[PDB]
Amino acid sequence: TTNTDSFTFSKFKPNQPNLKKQGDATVTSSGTLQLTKVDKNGVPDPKSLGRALYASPINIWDSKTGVVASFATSFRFTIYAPNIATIADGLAFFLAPVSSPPKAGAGFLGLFDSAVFNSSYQTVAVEFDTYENTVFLDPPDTHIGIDVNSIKSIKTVKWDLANGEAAKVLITYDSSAKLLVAALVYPSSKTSFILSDVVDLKSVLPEWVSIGFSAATGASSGYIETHDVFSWSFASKLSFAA
Amino acid sequence: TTNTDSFTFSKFKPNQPNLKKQGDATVTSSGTLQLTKVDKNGVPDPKSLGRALYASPINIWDSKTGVVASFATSFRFTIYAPNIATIADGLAFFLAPVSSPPKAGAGFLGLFDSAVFNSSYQTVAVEFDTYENTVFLDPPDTHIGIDVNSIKSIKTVKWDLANGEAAKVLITYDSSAKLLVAALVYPSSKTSFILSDVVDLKSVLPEWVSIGFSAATGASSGYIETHDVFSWSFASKLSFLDLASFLVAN
Amino acid sequence: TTNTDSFTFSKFKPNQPNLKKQGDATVTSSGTLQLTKVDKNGVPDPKSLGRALYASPINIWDSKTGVVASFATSFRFTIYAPNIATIADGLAFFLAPVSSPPKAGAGFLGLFDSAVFNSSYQTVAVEFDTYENTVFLDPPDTHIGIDVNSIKSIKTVKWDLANGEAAKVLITYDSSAKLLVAALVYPSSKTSFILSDVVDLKSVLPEWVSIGFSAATGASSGYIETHDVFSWSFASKLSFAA
Amino acid sequence: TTNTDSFTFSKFKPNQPNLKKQGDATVTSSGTLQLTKVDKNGVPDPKSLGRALYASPINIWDSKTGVVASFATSFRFTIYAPNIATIADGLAFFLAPVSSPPKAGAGFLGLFDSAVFNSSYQTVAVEFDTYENTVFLDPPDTHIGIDVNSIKSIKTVKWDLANGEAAKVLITYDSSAKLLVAALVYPSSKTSFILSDVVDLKSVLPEWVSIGFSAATGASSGYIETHDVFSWSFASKLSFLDLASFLVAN
Ligand SMILES: *[C@@H]1O[C@H](CO)[C@@H](O[C@@H]2O[C@H](CO)[C@@H](O[C@@H]3O[C@H](CO)[C@@H](O)[C@H](O[C@H]4O[C@H](CO)[C@@H](O)[C@H](O)[C@@H]4O)[C@@H]3O)[C@H](O)[C@H]2NC(C)=O)[C@H](O[C@@H]2O[C@@H](C)[C@@H](O)[C@@H](O)[C@@H]2O)[C@H]1NC(C)=O
Ligand SMILES: *[C@@H]1O[C@H](CO)[C@@H](O[C@@H]2O[C@H](CO)[C@@H](O[C@@H]3O[C@H](CO)[C@@H](O)[C@H](O)[C@@H]3O)[C@H](O)[C@H]2NC(C)=O)[C@H](O[C@@H]2O[C@@H](C)[C@@H](O)[C@@H](O)[C@@H]2O)[C@H]1NC(C)=O
Ligand SMILES: *[C@@H]1O[C@H](CO)[C@@H](O[C@@H]2O[C@H](CO)[C@@H](O[C@@H]3O[C@H](CO)[C@@H](O)[C@H](O)[C@@H]3O)[C@H](O)[C@H]2NC(C)=O)[C@H](O[C@@H]2O[C@@H](C)[C@@H](O)[C@@H](O)[C@@H]2O)[C@H]1NC(C)=O
Ligand SMILES: *[C@@H]1O[C@H](CO)[C@@H](O)[C@H](O)[C@H]1NC(C)=O
Ligand SMILES: [Ca+2]
Ligand SMILES: [Ca+2]
Ligand SMILES: [Ca+2]
Numbered sequence A, C: 001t002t003n004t005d006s007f008t009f010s011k012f013k014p015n016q017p018n019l020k021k022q023g024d025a026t027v028t029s030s031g032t033l034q035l036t037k038v039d040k041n042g043v044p045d046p047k048s049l050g051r052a053l054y055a056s057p058i059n060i061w062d063s064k065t066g067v068v069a070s071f072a073t074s075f076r077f078t079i080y081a082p083n084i085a086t087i088a089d090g091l092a093f094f095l096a097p098v099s100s101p102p103k104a105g106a107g108f109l110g111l112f113d114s115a116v117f118n119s120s121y122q123t124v125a126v127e128f129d130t131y132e133n134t135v136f137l138d139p140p141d142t143h144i145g146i147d148v149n150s151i152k153s154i155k156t157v158k159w160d161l162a163n164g165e166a167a168k169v170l171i172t173y174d175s176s177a178k179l180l181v182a183a184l185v186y187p188s189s190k191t192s193f194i195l196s197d198v199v200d201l202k203s204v205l206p207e208w209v210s211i212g213f214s215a216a217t218g219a220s221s222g223y224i225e226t227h228d229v230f231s232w233s234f235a236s237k238l239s240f241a242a
Numbered sequence B, D: 001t002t003n004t005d006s007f008t009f010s011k012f013k014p015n016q017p018n019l020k021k022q023g024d025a026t027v028t029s030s031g032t033l034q035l036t037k038v039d040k041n042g043v044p045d046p047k048s049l050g051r052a053l054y055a056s057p058i059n060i061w062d063s064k065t066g067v068v069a070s071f072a073t074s075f076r077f078t079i080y081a082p083n084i085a086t087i088a089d090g091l092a093f094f095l096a097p098v099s100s101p102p103k104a105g106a107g108f109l110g111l112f113d114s115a116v117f118n119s120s121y122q123t124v125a126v127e128f129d130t131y132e133n134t135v136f137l138d139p140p141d142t143h144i145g146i147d148v149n150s151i152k153s154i155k156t157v158k159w160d161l162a163n164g165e166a167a168k169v170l171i172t173y174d175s176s177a178k179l180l181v182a183a184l185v186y187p188s189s190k191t192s193f194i195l196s197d198v199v200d201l202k203s204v205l206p207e208w209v210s211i212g213f214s215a216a217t218g219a220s221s222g223y224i225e226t227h228d229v230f231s232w233s234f235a236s237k238l239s240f241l242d243l244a245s246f247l248v249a250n
């Protein structure tokens, strides 16, 4: 007995009513979702935080039956950094409760308030982290991480940013294997990165979540980068028994 | 460059935050979308009026390119009347300005305010109409209508209500033919009906539209019927559909 | 446990190896599947017979579990008759056993051998009949028909031929309702026909069936028309414990 | 103006005529496609090679229009080895011309006849390689690799085999960026591997190609492992795929 919800934005459009935008999020004339503040020149600013949600909650689990949804989302994104040596803070795909407020900037990625684990967050996220928060146990490498009610990622893998180049991303969740899987590929320069782990979405998330993007820039001048999104598809399936 | 927005409600849930319940519209505990009001008794009430819309506007055409969405939807619904001789007024699947407010009850079907045509409605519907308003040029028989900016359907055809029986609808809009088609089947009765006509969606809708059901029961006590929706499926693409593949399992 | 097989021919190409063509059927330069003989000049010929099948069998029902496929097919076809008053014989979408040869021409539609019902035809069809075979209890009008192990339709509805316009067809089988529905629209005329009936696929087909088209022109001189298909899409779904 | 062709085998079934079996490929009565010979015990035999292709050719590209197909494919497979430390040879998913004979075994994986690259193979493969063949430039570790007309990969990455555990694979081709990607995840060990390269196909493969799997065991006793496939979906679009939807509908 399956519900499904899916959409594909191959462009973005100014003021799109199917998209909830938060903090600094703009969608440009040219169709770019500009998650984080970027002046006329292309020049990203500090002290920024931006978010994008799909306008309707996704039913990721069902308490009557205990059935859990599988989902798959795909997106393409570009991090340009004026200076690659100083980069902060990163972007992320997440699933948080609905009407849940944006949270601290920088390392927090606009999804947390603190280094502390808290089951209250009810956030699961795949981060693309570009600055090392030693305070958070970040690997020293810029990384893909999987967060579960904590910015202190449960598992991380290296990810070598290709500055200004477009990354194609696939994020997967098999509900019967409880497997969350994230893969990033640079089409131009042909590199590849994968991270996978087990997350039991029912003990973590509410039945209904907002899905979308979060992004932050550095708390320090020069520690700046864009977080531009070009396209985004998603598809979730919630079957009620076998 | 193709956008797609799409979904399946095969079962409904109370309070479902991805739909916008308006008027009396609710979803019971066992999953039925009651568009229009029903006592626990199971007795349908008069002067009810309810709508359900998907909470996400749909991009139906793009002004910059001129490009227009194709779309498909299907659902399963029952109208049950305690008294088949006194049945009012109907239900409808529609597109309208985001997220439109319900308009007059009764034979207006929550979609219109009078018998006259008006472009500001910006509304296009397929009605499944159950009471003959002669001031709306209604045919004597129960009928499926296509309606554009008016309650006076621009084309109707016969529909024989099977009282208390689930009908399966496929409504369909091929953008290159500007073709709207509504098919209705009762699998229990083996009976079927189709209406087909053109409507140039770009002429009559805004770029963004809210999609849903609308239903009303009668303006006099006893003209009464349910307008229950069991399941619902929708799919659109806008390029700046694969229908076979869409039904066989949406 | 759901298997699925699906495709779309948005146009045909000559000797494309995923169709098997039988009889006179061929694919033209401009990508048309002419089921029946049309000459040099567009003049269709009599005594012609053509079938075009998907080169893969379709698992219609599973005997071990007794479950049965749902499937949906859509196609676009033109028949054009140079004399509207003298047209024959029709076309058909059908399911039948594999390596099951073409069968009698004319009014049997490449699908049968006599008037009589016969179980061992193991054939199910939706037909688009342009000539009254009185001998087959044909209605006195061009009709659409459901046929199950007989050219004697188990049900019909009136179909109004629109000479030389493309017809859009949607045929659909719902194995939970055991419900076969055929709809035909002409975009040009705005016209619309539907036929709906119960058919037990599990009763009348084997587990695997070829799926395709059959068509035939009239017997006598003059009872001629074309039977041209432009596009075809099929999808089926066979869940073992649904 | 877009063609399509997809399927999903969640089970395999004995004899299944939409699947063409070559060499030793057997489908177990419990549903496993056994690419290479697996005896009574369940003990894999050496000296084996098997292949299973989809029974109909796939249109990968069109010469008239020069347009080229995109495609996803996923599958579950298990390699079981009685001694983890004597293992050969490997399995692959390939695209070769119809109706390609199966070719040399062992480290050639049933796809190639020798170390030599050849254009007239018109074979592209994603390889799962379990034995180092120095004659083919194999890296010291077990690896996934992209093969184009040759048993010598154009690129590889360390694949660490988890013995007896189902691997889930995703293979994609983006014709728009001539880019082929293989990824494998062992859901039990939460462990993963991904491999990206550019390969044209228009220049390398015919318009029509058969597709499936190929496998082989070692050339000497004891160098043995199974190559068992549990499910398989495939999707191809060629305009003259929405992967996110593909995966979650398998
Ligand atoms: C529904 O479908 C089946 C087809 O599967 C028909 O049954 C078959 O009919 C054929 C043709 O009549 C029979 O073949 C016969 O088999 C015997 C040996 O078993 C042959 O020798 C025989 O030939 C003799 O007759 C010939 C013509 O008279 C000569 O040329 C030969 O010399 C030879 O002397 C012929 O090939 C099948 O055996 C029969 N199959 C089965 C499984 O029964 C149905 O036909 C009906 O039933 C038949 C028994 C027969 O009596 C027909 O007259 C019936 O139509 C067919 N049913 C209907 C209603 O059409
Ligand atoms: C579409 O619906 C709109 C809004 O309902 C119609 O506009 C209304 O039309 C009436 C004209 O018959 C107007 O009557 C007036 O009432 C006011 C006081 O409230 C008086 O001061 C005035 O003397 C009129 O009698 C009404 O004003 C008007 N409402 C609004 C909000 O403008 C509309 O009718 C069409 O446009 C309007 C503005 C007039 O020009 C009409 O003549 C015209 O037909 C509806 N359109 C159609 C095509 O039916
Ligand atoms: C790469 O792949 C091509 C195509 O298979 C190879 O060419 C083929 O080689 C075969 C010999 O190994 C040729 O077949 C023989 O033809 C003669 C003449 O009738 C027969 O008497 C004999 O018994 C064989 O059937 C085959 O003709 C040829 N195929 C084609 C399509 O031309 C190719 O091998 C190289 O080219 C040929 C001309 C011979 O010189 C070979 O020795 C040769 O290596 C393969 N390339 C390599 C480097 O291995
Ligand atoms: C978690 O969050 C809530 C409010 O958001 C707070 O009351 C609580 O103290 C939190 N921290 C921990 C460690 O539980
Ligand atoms: Ca960090
Ligand atoms: Ca009415
Ligand atoms: Ca006839």
Ligand SMILES: [Ca+2]
Binding pocket: D089, D090, D107, D129, D130, D131, D132, D133, D138
């Ligand atoms: Ca090797």
Ligand SMILES: [Mn+2]
Binding pocket: A127, A129, A138, A139, A143, A145, A151, A153
């Ligand atoms: Mn981190």
Ligand SMILES: [Mn+2]
Binding pocket: B127, B129, B136, B138, B139, B143, B145, B151, B153
């Ligand atoms: Mn009406």
Ligand SMILES: [Mn+2]
Binding pocket: C127, C129, C138, C139, C143, C145, C151, C153
């Ligand atoms: Mn007939």
Ligand SMILES: [Mn+2]
Binding pocket: D127, D129, D136, D138, D143, D145, D151, D153
């Ligand atoms: Mn290798």
